[PDB]
């Protein structure tokens, strides 16, 4: 068997394609179940983010496993298999553990430790899933450990990037007071702002946030009133879990143009995958659409990032990688090697039921098994086989 | 071509190597070659340590080799004029290049510089090579995979023989039999394989679908290629691409 | 002292162990050019080599060969002479034979060339001046009998006999400081070379075998004996009636 | 932890005047093994003693201390000061030592002792070692494996075909030192009709010689030689006519075992001169160690003396087998060396392989006491459970160690 990671990244696939592979936290167990139903898959896990959508699986054979998973991706996203095969991120075993550890540590920016919070959610959701086997789950738990150790002992988000994307420009308006929206508000405070219109389905979360940030003024407007407060502001932050765009061509080209105090152009920062603006909106002259793909225009500098990461985090990553590789093959010779029972038992029963033609046999056997069982540990089991 | 530019290979060899031969003309104009360690600045321009005089004849060559996978040896010869810089500011600029590379303290009055006129670039021994303009050489970038190419090559040669074997079948037009193959080297555009055949030994260049910038991208791209090769061998998806026909006789 | 082999001998050893060099040619427009080359050598150290390019009308030429020893030091030689295609068709066959034995390969006989050795320049390492060697002394010199196993034996000793080596720094050489590290660099018929690290700096010393050594077991034995004597002296079982080495070679 | 060490003097490293002092004949091998093993750091011992070699093989606790002890013993028993021995001392540890003795058994360290002999000698070391206590398991194994290597190289290689032997080299030297003819003019005499002498005769006959006077104790030994080699006239004469035989001889070969020399200067000086037809010089070719011919004998002007050392003069041999049948042997040897070190590594199992079947017995008895057919049941269970790990490789030992204490 072997561990495989098969995914799509913001480095290769554009948002309009990745969003079709997007699987919200709801369908995760269902997804994993479907995945394990394939002939060459024993265990599975799904990681969906603004930047990546990756699938971690266990396969008996690599090629057929990748084949099946890719066809599943096609069937569930409605994307031609070869078209996926172009933008396909593929890694096996040790390189896969390396990659996921890198992801947890947050070197794949743009998420430190914000890309780690999305992993604990995976291991917690996958608690009641039988498709979340020992290899992949253990791999993700180890990924959490690596994430934490690399987070605390290093330098070490999409929201802040979005806020700072205002360089392309108060009068603020964020749609969706989720953890993402709350972070956006925080970074709106950080860069000196005291007026935001927070549109949310619930007044509970918005009022809960207002009680945490008494310096900034929070104005609640109903979710179905999103269009009115779109032409009432200059910049709109869409941070909702919608599976369909909230704005389109129709809703935006009749809106009273924003005050020319700041250009007259309205900014639609769409920090959600799947998108909430639908790309087409940008066809209006008095407004522009900036999705998560355009959130790499913050600081194009790889002098500190690459150097510090390679010279500081990679040692931890490699140590923990080889450690997990010393955890994987070792934690599979634990419930399988104890098959030495069936041998011993066969020697125990026979010899007894041959002599009968009980505390003694059980005594000898169990006391002879006390040694090896309780305790280069791979040679401790392989030699017995 | 699916190989990097000759200038790029030259720069790659000048970054990865540290030892070479300095060829000059002595009195009576007799050729003399002599062992030399070198460092290189951001433009590829080599600085060396000589203990002896550089003669009145400053015309010289610096020949550098890079043995790849114990199989082929790319090489380059920098033709140019040698000299000692006067400015105690550029002397520091050089001694720092040295210190960075070798982690050593260099006797400053031993630093010489070869002004690059042009570079002869070769893939292996027994080849004519392609000449490379100095400005070209200067503007070229060392291959980004150069520090990790040897490792990836060893790993693939030890853990992926089936993939290479299949690669000979589905990617290149081998109009003959194939008994044994290895991978010699890998770079941003693709990789090179040595095919051992009774009819003769050949070198093949198989390109990556897209350019690669690092180890992860490289391994992923390779994985994609071996996957697609497996899928075309057992005939699942069509081979909607182009086959490689350019072979290269070696001994 | 020297307790080293003669430079001629070192040049022959280098020419036997190595297979790669640089051919310095004087190109059309009076500009020197160095070209990578493989070579083999006949019973007289004369290099025969495979060249691809058009030989050039000026036949004056040089072959430069390096031998890196234990990643610490690179003895070098440069053969100055005249390159030429072989005259008869018989010598072509002899040279194809030596080339065959060395490389196990066949090659285009029109690509075979010979450097008639005028003289040889032998250098102990990078940045040395080196000594000139007449061609007839180079011709009559023999390659070191230990050359094929020197690298291996140096590795084994460095991995397995640090206590012995370190002790040698004390009992066999008259140092004036505290040895912080040591490696053996190389070994030949007469002794071996140690690199000694120190707070002061880095030094190279040559310690001779009591008697010249001929084969692998002879070298191993000689080494064992020197280890035994060094230990017996340190544990004070024996007198140090012998003289210590004093000469050191500073290295950056 | 314990090392195999070879400590010795060889024909390469030391002169015969020194080596013959260290020589130890068969009858005294066990005594030497006893004394050696009496030293603090020597656990096992053997002695290979030939006209080319005086080598002591020991299994030793510390190799430095073992070497010091054995060297001191060599000094004590020979009379040679420790420092001189150190000047000529040959020293190899472990794998190098096994390599060495295999090369010796294989006949690679020529000159060989002729037909079998050296192999038959290693055989004898094992044979005499049979009774002796200090001939431990490691050294017994080493020598047995060496006999094996000797056999492989013997049969599976033609290295024995064109091989220089002490005896043939002796005859060759004798012939080099004589004048010019299809040499039958010189009167040949062999003293000692043993194996070496018999070979001297074989080679004399091979060089055209048609008459030889053989001096020996046993007459039947010489009659048997006579029966094997009818083509040559062999005249037998008893030991007590040695001089009379030397008197009528131009070149004398001595190949007997004697702790004191047979010929002294006084014996040789009043012999009639050798014929002018052969140079007027008597040639004493002495292939025995200790020497059968006194050192003083060379002081006789009309006499010459050659010992085993001088056979170096005949290294001249037409052979491209310098490596051919020597790499043919080198392969077998590099094979059998690993094949032996494996065995020595396997010998480290015994303590664990014992403590295991001790622990199991404690378990089965302690359980059988709570029990009281059944006594047969316990043995059945334990022995069937033990048939696995007990036949199995070092990782098994390292596992059982931490798994059973």
Swiss-Prot record, chain A:
Ligase found in the keyword field: no
UniProt pathway: Porphyrin-containing compound metabolism; chlorophyll biosynthesis; Porphyrin-containing compound metabolism; protoporphyrin-IX biosynthesis; 5-aminolevulinate from L-glutamyl-tRNA(Glu): step 1/2
Protein location: Plastid, Chloroplast membrane
EC top class named in words: oxidoreductase
Signal peptide (from-to): none
Binding site for NADP(+): 176-181
Binding residue positions for substrate: 49-52, 109, 112-114, 118
Gene Ontology molecular functions: glutamyl-tRNA reductase activity; NADP binding
Superkingdom, natural source: Eukaryota
GO cellular component, one term: chloroplast membrane
Family that this chain belongs to: Belongs to the glutamyl-tRNA reductase family.
More details: During catalysis, the active site Cys acts as a nucleophile attacking the alpha-carbonyl group of tRNA-bound glutamate with the formation of a thioester intermediate between enzyme and glutamate, and the concomitant release of tRNA(Glu). The thioester intermediate is finally reduced by direct hydride transfer from NADPH, to form the product GSA.
Protein name per the record: Glutamyl-tRNA reductase 1, chloroplastic
Organism per entry: Arabidopsis thaliana
Parent-protein residues present: 95 to 520 of 543
Curated annotation (Swiss-Prot), chain B:
Gene Ontology BP, a term: photosynthetic electron transport chain
Keyword Chloroplast: yes
Keywords from the UniProt entry: Chlorophyll biosynthesis, Chloroplast, Heme biosynthesis, Plastid, Transit peptide
Subcellular location: Plastid, Chloroplast stroma
Record note on disruption phenotype: Reduced growth, slightly pale green leaves, reduced levels of chlorophyll and heme, and low non-photochemical quenching (NPQ).
This protein's record includes keyword Plastid: yes
Domain of life: Eukaryota
Chief localisation class: plastid
GO MF annotations, alphabetized: protein-membrane adaptor activity
Gene Ontology CC: one annotated term: chloroplast stroma
Subunit structure: Interacts with HEMA1 and forms a heterotetramer of two GLUTRBP and two HEMA1 subunits.
Function: Involved in the regulation of glutamyl-tRNA reductase (GluTR) which is important for the synthesis and distribution of 5-aminolevulinate, a precursor in heme and chlorophyll biosynthesis. Stimulates GluTR activity and regulates glutamate-1-semialdehyde release. May play a role in heme metabolism. Necessary for efficient photosynthetic electron transport in chloroplasts.
Protein name: Glutamyl-tRNA reductase-binding protein, chloroplastic
Section of the entire sequence shown: 56 to 306 of 317
């Amino acid at each position: 068997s072997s561990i495989v990671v098969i995914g799509l990244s913001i480095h290769t696939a554009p948002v309009e394609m990745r969003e079709k592979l997007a699987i919200p936290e709801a369908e995760w167990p269902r997804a994993i179940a479907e995945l394990c139903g394939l002939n060459h898959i024993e265990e599975a896990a799904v990681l969906s983010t603004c930047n990546r959508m990756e699938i971690y699986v266990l396969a008996l054979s690599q090629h057929r496993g990748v084949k099946e998973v890719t066809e599943w991706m096609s069937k569930t996203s409605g994307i031609p298999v070869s078209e996926i095969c172009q933008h396909r991120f593929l890694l096996y075993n040790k390189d896969a553990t390396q990659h996921i550890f890198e992801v947890s540590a947050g070197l794949d920016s743009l998420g430190e430790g914000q890309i780690l919070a999305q992993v604990k959610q995976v291991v917690k959701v996958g608690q009641g899933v039988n498709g979340f086997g020992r290899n992949i789950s253990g791999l993700f738990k180890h990924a959490i450990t690596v994430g934490k150790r690399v987070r605390t002992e290093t330098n070490i988000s999409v929201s802040s990037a979005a806020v700072e994307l205002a360089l392309m420009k108060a009068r603020m308006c964020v749609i969706g007071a989720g953890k993402m929206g709350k972070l956006v508000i925080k970074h709106l405070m950080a860069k000196g702002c005291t007026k935001v219109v927070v549109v949310n389905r619930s007044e509970e979360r918005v009022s809960a946030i207002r009680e945490e940030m008494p310096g900034i003024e929070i104005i609640y407007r109903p979710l179905d009133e999103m269009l009115a407060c779109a032409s009432e502001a200059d910049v709109v932050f869409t941070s909702t879990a919608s599976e369909t765009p909230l704005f389109l061509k129709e809703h935006v080209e009749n809106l009273p143009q924003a005050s020319p105090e700041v250009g007259g152009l309205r900014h639609f920062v769409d920090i959600s995958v799947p998108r909430n603006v639908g790309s087409c909106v940008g066809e209006v002259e008095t407004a522009r659409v900036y999705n998560v793909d355009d959130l790499k225009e913050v600081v194009a500098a790889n002098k500190e990032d690459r150097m510090r990461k390679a010279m500081e985090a990679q040692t931890i990553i490699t140590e923990e990688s080889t450690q997990f590789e010393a955890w994987r093959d070792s934690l599979e010779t634990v419930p399988t090697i104890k098959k030495l029972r069936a041998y011993a038992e066969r020697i125990r029963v026979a010899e007894l039921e041959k002599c009968m033609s009980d505390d003694l046999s059980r005594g000898i056997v169990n006391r002879f098994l006390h040694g090896p069982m309780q305790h280069e540990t791979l040679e401790n089991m392989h030699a017995l086989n | 071509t699916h190989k990097p530019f000759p200038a790029e290979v030259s720069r790659s060899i000048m970054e990865l190597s540290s030892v070479g031969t300095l060829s000059t003309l002595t009195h009576d104009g007799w050729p003399l070659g002599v062992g030399v360690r070198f460092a290189v600045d951001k433009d590829g321009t080599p600085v060396l340590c000589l203990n002896r005089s550089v003669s009145p004849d400053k015309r010289s060559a610096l020949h550098v080799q890079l043995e790849q996978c114990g199989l082929r040896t790319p090489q380059c010869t920098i033709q140019g004029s040698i000299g000692r810089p006067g400015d105690d500011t550029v002397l520091k600029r050089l001694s720092a290049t040295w210190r960075e590379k070798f982690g050593e303290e260099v006797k400053e009055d031993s630093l010489y510089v070869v002004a690059v006129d042009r570079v002869l670039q070769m893939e292996d021994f027994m080849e004519d090579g392609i000449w490379v303009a100095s400005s070209d050489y200067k503007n070229a970038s060392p291959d980004p995979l150069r520090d990790i190419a040897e490792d990836i090559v060893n790993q693939i040669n030890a853990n992926n023989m089936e993939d290479i074997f299949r690669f000979c079948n589905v990617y290149v037009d081998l109009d003959f039999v194939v008994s044994e193959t290895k991978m010699i080297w890998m770079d941003r555009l693709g990789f090179d394989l040595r095919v051992w055949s009774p009819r003769g030994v050949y070198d093949v260049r198989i390109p990556f679908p897209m350019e690669v910038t690092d180890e992860k991208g490289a391994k992923s791209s390779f994985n994609g290629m071996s996957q697609l090769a497996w899928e075309v061998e057992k005939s699942y998806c069509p081979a909607d691409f182009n086959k490689v026909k350019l072979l290269k006789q070696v001994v």
